[PDB]
Amino acid sequence: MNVIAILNHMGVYFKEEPIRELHRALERLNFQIVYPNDRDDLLKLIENNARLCGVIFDWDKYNLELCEEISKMNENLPLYAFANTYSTLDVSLNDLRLQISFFEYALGAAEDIANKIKQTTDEYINTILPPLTKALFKYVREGKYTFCTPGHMGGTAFQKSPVGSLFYDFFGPNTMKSDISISVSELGSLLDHSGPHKEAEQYIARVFNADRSYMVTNGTSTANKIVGMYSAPAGSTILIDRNCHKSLTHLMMMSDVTPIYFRPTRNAYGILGGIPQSEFQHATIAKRVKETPNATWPVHAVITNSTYDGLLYNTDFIKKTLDVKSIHFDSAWVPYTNFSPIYEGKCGMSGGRVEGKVIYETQSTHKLLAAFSQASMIHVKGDVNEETFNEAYMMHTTTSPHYGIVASTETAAAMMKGNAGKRLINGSIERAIKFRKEIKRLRTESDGWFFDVWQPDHIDTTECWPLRSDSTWHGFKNIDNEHMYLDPIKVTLLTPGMEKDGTMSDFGIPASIVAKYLDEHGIVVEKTGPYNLLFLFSIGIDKTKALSLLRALTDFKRAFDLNLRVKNMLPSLYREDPEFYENMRIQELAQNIHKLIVHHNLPDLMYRAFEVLPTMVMTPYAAFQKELHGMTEEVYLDEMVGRINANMILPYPPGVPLVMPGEMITEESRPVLEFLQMLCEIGAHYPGFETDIHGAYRQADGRYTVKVLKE
Amino acid sequence: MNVIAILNHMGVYFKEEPIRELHRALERLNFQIVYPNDRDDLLKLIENNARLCGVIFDWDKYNLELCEEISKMNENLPLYAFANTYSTLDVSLNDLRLQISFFEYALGAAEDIANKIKQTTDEYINTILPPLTKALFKYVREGKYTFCTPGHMGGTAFQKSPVGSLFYDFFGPNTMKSDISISVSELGSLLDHSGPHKEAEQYIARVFNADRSYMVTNGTSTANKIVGMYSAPAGSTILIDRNCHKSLTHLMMMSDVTPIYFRPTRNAYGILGGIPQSEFQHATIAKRVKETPNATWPVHAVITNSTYDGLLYNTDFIKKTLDVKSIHFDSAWVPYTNFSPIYEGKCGMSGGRVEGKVIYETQSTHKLLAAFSQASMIHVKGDVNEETFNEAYMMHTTTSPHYGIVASTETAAAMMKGNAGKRLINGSIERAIKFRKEIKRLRTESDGWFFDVWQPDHIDTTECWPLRSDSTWHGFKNIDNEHMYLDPIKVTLLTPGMEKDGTMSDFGIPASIVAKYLDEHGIVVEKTGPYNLLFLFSIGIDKTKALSLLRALTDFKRAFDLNLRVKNMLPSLYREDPEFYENMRIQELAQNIHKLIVHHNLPDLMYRAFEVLPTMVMTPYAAFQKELHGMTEEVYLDEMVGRINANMILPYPPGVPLVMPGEMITEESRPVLEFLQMLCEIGAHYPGFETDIHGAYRQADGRYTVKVLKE
Amino acid sequence: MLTRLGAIVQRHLQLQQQQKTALTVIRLGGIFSRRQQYQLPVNVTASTLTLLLQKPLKLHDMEVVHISFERSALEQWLSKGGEIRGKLNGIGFAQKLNLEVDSAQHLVVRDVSLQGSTLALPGSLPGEIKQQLEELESDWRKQHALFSEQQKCLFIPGDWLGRIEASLQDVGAQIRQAQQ
Ligand SMILES: *Cc1c(COP(=O)(O)O)cnc(C)c1O
Ligand SMILES: *Cc1c(COP(=O)(O)O)cnc(C)c1O
Numbered sequence A, B: 001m002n003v004i005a006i007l008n009h010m011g012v013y014f015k016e017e018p019i020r021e022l023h024r025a026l027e028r029l030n031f032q033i034v035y036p037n038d039r040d041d042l043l044k045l046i047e048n049n050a051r052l053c054g055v056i057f058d059w060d061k062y063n064l065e066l067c068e069e070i071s072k073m074n075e076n077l078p079l080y081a082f083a084n085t086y087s088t089l090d091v092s093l094n095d096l097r098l099q100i101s102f103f104e105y106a107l108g109a110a111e112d113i114a115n116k117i118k119q120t121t122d123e124y125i126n127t128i129l130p131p132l133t134k135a136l137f138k139y140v141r142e143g144k145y146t147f148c149t150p151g152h153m154g155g156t157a158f159q160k161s162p163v164g165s166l167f168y169d170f171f172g173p174n175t176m177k178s179d180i181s182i183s184v185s186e187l188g189s190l191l192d193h194s195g196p197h198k199e200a201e202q203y204i205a206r207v208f209n210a211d212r213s214y215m216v217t218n219g220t221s222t223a224n225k226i227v228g229m230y231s232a233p234a235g236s237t238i239l240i241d242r243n244c245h246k247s248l249t250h251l252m253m254m255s256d257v258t259p260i261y262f263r264p265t266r267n268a269y270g271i272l273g274g275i276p277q278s279e280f281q282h283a284t285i286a287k288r289v290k291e292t293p294n295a296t297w298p299v300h301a302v303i304t305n306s307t308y309d310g311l312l313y314n315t316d317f318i319k320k321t322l323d324v325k326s327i328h329f330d331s332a333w334v335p336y337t338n339f340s341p342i343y344e345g346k347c348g349m350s351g352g353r354v355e356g357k358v359i360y361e362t363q364s365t366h367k368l369l370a371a372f373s374q375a376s377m378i379h380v381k382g383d384v385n386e387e388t389f390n391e392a393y394m395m396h397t398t399t400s401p402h403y404g405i406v407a408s409t410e411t412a413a414a415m416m417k418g419n420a421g422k423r424l425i426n427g428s429i430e431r432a433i434k435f436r437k438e439i440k441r442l443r444t445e446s447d448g449w450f451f452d453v454w455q456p457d458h459i460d461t462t463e464c465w466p467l468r469s470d471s472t473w474h475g476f477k478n479i480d481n482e483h484m485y486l487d488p489i490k491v492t493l494l495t496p497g498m499e500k501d502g503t504m505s506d507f508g509i510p511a512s513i514v515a516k517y518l519d520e521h522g523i524v525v526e527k528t529g530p531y532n533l534l535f536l537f538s539i540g541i542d543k544t545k546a547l548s549l550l551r552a553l554t555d556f557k558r559a560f561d562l563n564l565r566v567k568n569m570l571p572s573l574y575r576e577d578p579e580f581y582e583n584m585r586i587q588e589l590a591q592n593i594h595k596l597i598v599h600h601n602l603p604d605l606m607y608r609a610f611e612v613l614p615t616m617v618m619t620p621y622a623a624f625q626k627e628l629h630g631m632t633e634e635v636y637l638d639e640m641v642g643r644i645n646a647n648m649i650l651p652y653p654p655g656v657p658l659v660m661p662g663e664m665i666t667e668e669s670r671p672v673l674e675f676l677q678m679l680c681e682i683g684a685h686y687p688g689f690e691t692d693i694h695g696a697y698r699q700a701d702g703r704y705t706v707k708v709l710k711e
Numbered sequence C: 001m002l003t004r005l006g007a008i009v010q011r012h013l014q015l016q017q018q019q020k021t022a023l024t025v026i027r028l029g030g031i032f033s034r035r036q037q038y039q040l041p042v043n044v045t046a047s048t049l050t051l052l053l054q055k056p057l058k059l060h061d062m063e064v065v066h067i068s069f070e071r072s073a074l075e076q077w078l079s080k081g082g083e084i085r086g087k088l089n090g091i092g093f094a095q096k097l098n099l100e101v102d103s104a105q106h107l108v109v110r111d112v113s114l115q116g117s118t119l120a121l122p123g124s125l126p127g128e129i130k131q132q133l134e135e136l137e138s139d140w141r142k143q144h145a146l147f148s149e150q151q152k153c154l155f156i157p158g159d160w161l162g163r164i165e166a167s168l169q170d171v172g173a174q175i176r177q178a179q180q
Helices: A015-029 A039-047 A111-129 A133-141 A162-168 A196-207 A221-230 A246-252 A287-290 A315-321 A389-394 A403-415 A419-444 A509-516 A541-562 A586-600 A604-608 A621-627 A670-682 B017-029 B041-046 B111-129 B131-143 B163-173 B195-205 B218-229 B246-254 B280-291 B315-321 B386-395 B403-414 B419-445 B511-518 B543-561 B587-601 B602-611 B619-627 B670-682 C002-017 C073-078 C127-147 C158-174
Strands: A003-006 A032-034 A052-058 A078-081 A214-216 A234-240 A258-261 A300-303 A327-329 A359-361 A376-380 A492-494 A630-636 A708-710 B003-006 B032-034 B052-056 B237-239 B299-301 B327-329 B357-363 B377-382 B632-636 B650-652 B692-694 B703-711 C050-053 C084-088 C091-096 C098-101 C107-110
Touching: A003 A039, A015 A032, A039 A052, A052 A111, A078 A111, A078 C091, A111 B163, A133 A196, A133 A403, A162 B111, A162 B403, A196 A214, A196 A376, A196 A403, A196 B195, A214 A221, A214 A403, A221 A246, A234 B003, A315 A327, A359 C098, A403 A419, A403 B163, A419 A541, A509 A541, A509 A586, A541 A586, A586 A604, A586 A670, A604 A670, A621 B386, B003 B041, B017 B032, B017 B111, B041 B052, B052 B111, B131 B195, B131 B403, B131 B602, B163 B403, B218 B246, B246 B619, B280 B386, B315 B327, B511 B543, B511 B587, B543 B587, B587 B670, B602 B670, B650 B670, C002 C127, C091 C127, C127 C158
Parallel strands: A003 A032, A003 A052, A052 A078, A234 A258, A234 A300, A300 A327, A327 A359, B003 B032, B003 B052, B237 B299, B299 B327, B327 B357
Antiparallel strands: A214 A376, A359 A376, A630 A708, B357 B377, B632 B703, B650 B692, C084 C091, C098 C107
16 A cells, blocks of 8 residues: 555646655655556556555646546545645535545645655554454554463564474564464453454444344354354254255254254256245244144244355345244355345345344355455344353354454455445446356357356346246246345356256256366366356456456367367366276267266256155254264165165255255155165266265265164 | 575685685575684574574584584584595494585586575475475465455455555465465365375374374364263263363363362462372272262263463373273373473373273463464374264364464474474473572572572472472472472462461562563563462573563562652553552552451462362253253352352462352352452452452442352 | 065165175275275174185185184274284184285285185075065055954945055055065
8 A cells, every 4th residue: 555646747847846856755655656647547546456545636627527436436545636726625525525635836845745645644544444453453563562372472483493484484474473362451352342352343233234243263164053052942943944054964963953944946957946935934834843743833944045056035025924033044155235236125134123033144254255264254133142142152262263364354344345345246246247248149149059147038237137937047947926036246157958948958068077177277166067057256256367267168169169189178187097088089078978967867866856855753963962872884875765864965966965864765755865876877987077975985886875873 | 594504714715716606696596695603603503593504514624513413403404515535424423314415616517506505495395394384385386276265365355445455465475375275176175184184184193192183273172172072972971170271161061961070289379289199099989970960980081281380290190090981181281291301101192002091182282382373283092983073073163274274283293393393392491490590599699588489499400390298399288299290391480478388477479469560561471369470481482581581570679679659660550540559659559468368368268268169969061051041140249158150250369260150059168158258358449459250240339249040 | 565565676686796706895984094894784694604715725824614703893893993803614712814905895814925815705586585575465464454354344435445455455466576
């Protein structure tokens, strides 16, 4: 932060001479001087250059063209406008947040002006930063307390060993001096929630529109376990969603509760829809309570909103129909449903305080924002616990939290506040819609097959596309209107290979080959499998990383139409088995795999398996108690009919749990076992595309085994 | 790491000219050149300067005076010795680990020599660093993958916001690029325990002498809870120590187990002794099983070795007498009992594998070493079931661990290998014994009172001082011989105020007044209270911090003998209450507090309130279940006899728990309640010396109220 | 009875490649350092079962044709590690052998000459299929015996006798087909 802009040349000498005198004075305090051209030149030095903090221009030249466009981006940006004798303000400059510093063209006084710019810049630093981050930067330059934790104390112990000096020179002196415990008084303590830490929780909840936002120092997986131990006593009932995460599985194994699983909608491409509106009515909550033995009134409900693919629900209908006093929204993938008008009434934080209910959201921090790892937040919309609830938070968090993660956690809430932060959300949507239009433009004009985006036929608007009932792009049979939405920054590339009715085609390329092709250039696919490709277009993906993805997609069509070899295209796959992948081309591999999907019938064995629910014998908490005693056996793949499993089957593809730990597979869930036996044959003929199931371990012959319980 | 040493001068020209040509070549690749004098000059450039990696000297001048002293300090240190025509090795140079690189005195080839030194230095970096840390440093300069977690992606999102640029420029470019999740293939995953993470666990266990070691990413408070969830099923019995930590209290409140508390020894000064050998017998443990309702055979034991003060035990007698298959040693304060001959057979790792038993240790990493916060280890010595113990490790650790802490956790284990690491433990012991001798030297020669070190009369030896039964310095009534040892680096300062028999004296200065004077200069007291102190002298405490502590102690005697004012000595205490601390001097405050200790009788009430254990009605797990339902209330301190408390009382002083959450104060534990009422009267007359008890809320009248359970 | 008859048909097709005779060792689930192994489930249930071998070896300076292992001792060596102890020819004490894991999931017995020997189990409509089928067939006669006594009720419609009897004969006609 040391860029000073000097716009417009008046041509005279009594105004340009103080500019040259100030040019030699600002460089003595480390400041970069730039000279833009016209009015449009200065506008490009703010959005693309965020390290600017000084604009010098003539007040009697552009008093209305510059004081309006700059205020729409950065409001607290200082403006070093030089006025004259006959200078005045304007009536249209009253409702604009600006910082104008008036000066003169006095010769010899350039030294006093340089001291005022440095002091004004320091005021901008001490304003946009939160009090928690301000206390961390000040403690390094002044706080030098001895005999404290940790033992390195800013890297002192590393300067006494040759191997330790290599680790200290990598980061920096300011990095090691910022890792302190709670042994400092002027920085407060996270476990006590006082001082700077008390105002930090009120600053995040106010910006993100909440009542009390916490700062979890152990990722999102820990935040979902602390909240689950609150509204679920030892012997209750929860309404957990079927499409749950691995962190939510361990929650049911540590609390003696009786969960009730839902049946979300799904199609044939593997993209799971959402929970229908019929599962939220009053005739449905108490419907499965009396049928399932040992179950009381549900006091907590976990809703995956949004899912792993990015499909927002309708919170305006759930907060009124679902009669649960503790509704949880797994918003671990949408930490931005507030800074845009196309997200009002779509999340739990949007709206007001529901009478007699509370909204629980565990939005991830180190996923689609800008902070260090092991960080999460807990949003509150209503009345919760804090005194006794703090005891449960300390059970998973050590007494010496890492302030480097806490300082970056609150930073994500400060980088989004104001118009300067809202341009990152709207900018990511505009870059996502532009990327969606480039696919349809390069599809009809091209000569041959091309990728397709799972989007409606009309994408001219800038909002969330609803999933209606008279459309064919979503393919969800019997879907509720005004319930399922679409995330514009979640572009889902549908590779050719299937029709629009749910059957199979004759010419197509699976998404598994394209997934490994993007890794050669440096692009990691988020989700892949059947005929879908998921990507993340958050604030981290700028215009460079967004346009580079389309260039890699056009190279796959060129290499496939010309019929190239595997060695001259995929060097990583060739090193796995050079003997088998010797005389094989790119067209021979794509056609042999496509015939195996039709022969083994993948869409039918997948749509019928994940739809039905296996018979749950006991609670997931009882399955963990049997493992601690040492009564876990295993059988073959064709011998697990009628046994109680102990693990959570997570087959890749897709990416959702299949059988929960503590369920029995009988005659009702026969297609469930058929999906596991199909993957054991399709992923054994060609190396590289082996079967990946978090539960079905690989042996040495081909058949997989699962962990069950003893009889 | 860029210091090159050129020792000695042959006086000729055919040997000094290649040195001058090499002087201009090494500076082009960023290297510092130093010219030491005699043999004693080079020895000072290694112990004090750790950033050295090049030693240039004549081989035909000092072939035995340099190859022996350098080998005793570093094994892999490159030696750029220049040999001649008639040069040979020595018979006494066969059992020494050295790296000698021979060269010649050829002109013009100075450029080729500079390339060999840079490549040799790179080999030294890739050898002393572990494969996990080396892969992290190489991934920054080469690995540039896109579409991965977290969202910052090496600090990309911070370069688009004005507030984000200030947070990115504080640390460094290499800091943000090193924070990666499990989205990297060539580095493996921590939860999967494969690849670089697999060899990292075997490397730490080999250095610290163990079979398997873990890397907890959530501090020591989390590692102690994972061990308790393994050898203690839902309905068992554990042998937890009375001197437990706040983290160990939550372990008893999350598992439905029946703990059995021991009866450690103690003196009058407040120094926590240890558990006698009679409690480890078979007839003693089995006697408390029948007396405690709902308790079976103990299958786990928790021993705090060492305590918070610094007194080791005797593991050679515990591992044979204590018949527990799961013995735990909370080594959260001794991460060095291995690399020294005066620490053999004192910890759980020293020795061999005990059949039918196993040792669990949770050594703290960011306490007395050099690493980031939220770091711990799990040392297991025996044959256990990793498939069960790892299940509890994944439930308390997120799926995306912070590799910045893991890279520093293994770094602490790499800083101990070789002679460069052995001098850190022995160096802190030599500085501790020297500091102990400076106290006794400045005590007799001084004219008046002086501080005393809790040490035997003979400290001439260099080992752990045993606590015998024919001594008067320890003051423990009936102590077991060859069972309690003294920690040399843990210097316990005793302020004059009590006698050698356990009574009081007329002239005395409490340790709380001295603790406030040390904080003015920046010295933070680790433990303080009645008439005792404690300081941490780990490997990070150099000779500067050791000599600065004695100077601050001598200044307290000068300010007290001359009778100065509080305002002209303690400016921090004066700002708390300038009206009351106006006409008060340093001698008036030191005498008024000493009379309150004798009047209220502190040593007698404290010694009798810790031996008699309160009656435990229910298990600590049942007390937490009644708190979530809303059946808790607060009562007065004078009205609580016969009620079950809900929190843990932790009065300061000392630092040990008083009443466990779930105990009842009846007629047997009468002095226990008298200890709480005594601190409320002595800590309410003079500002700054308020009563600090964790669990006692302060009201408006001065009577503390504790939270109990409803009847 | 349909949920039990369908499992017999699937089990009958699995035993076609097990009843020349090898022994495939399965890997037990979990996250452990050493690659642990697990025994066979319903295939073997005895405690002191015997195991055969192909190429004989000279162990303890004597020949052997069958080696018996203990079920209580095999589950501990294949999980916690250590050394296995097994007697020879069903007599003597449980001597120590040099048994390791094979790449094709087998039991290779090493001797003083570093020789391989794959172990196998002794072999016998399989016996397990016939045993599990007669228990299910006997349950059909017990349920049909109650229906062949209370059918004389006057308060029962006559049209329902054609559907209840047809449902019982459908299972009986299918359970008698697999035993052919
Ligand atoms: C990725 C994810 C997590 C894990 O996130 P961490 O912050 O790394 O613990 C938890 N829940 C959901 C729904 C996720 O997608
Ligand atoms: C300080 C301490 C802890 C807490 O250490 P962390 O690494 O911060 O979790 C736990 N146990 C004991 C005995 C301690 O002294």
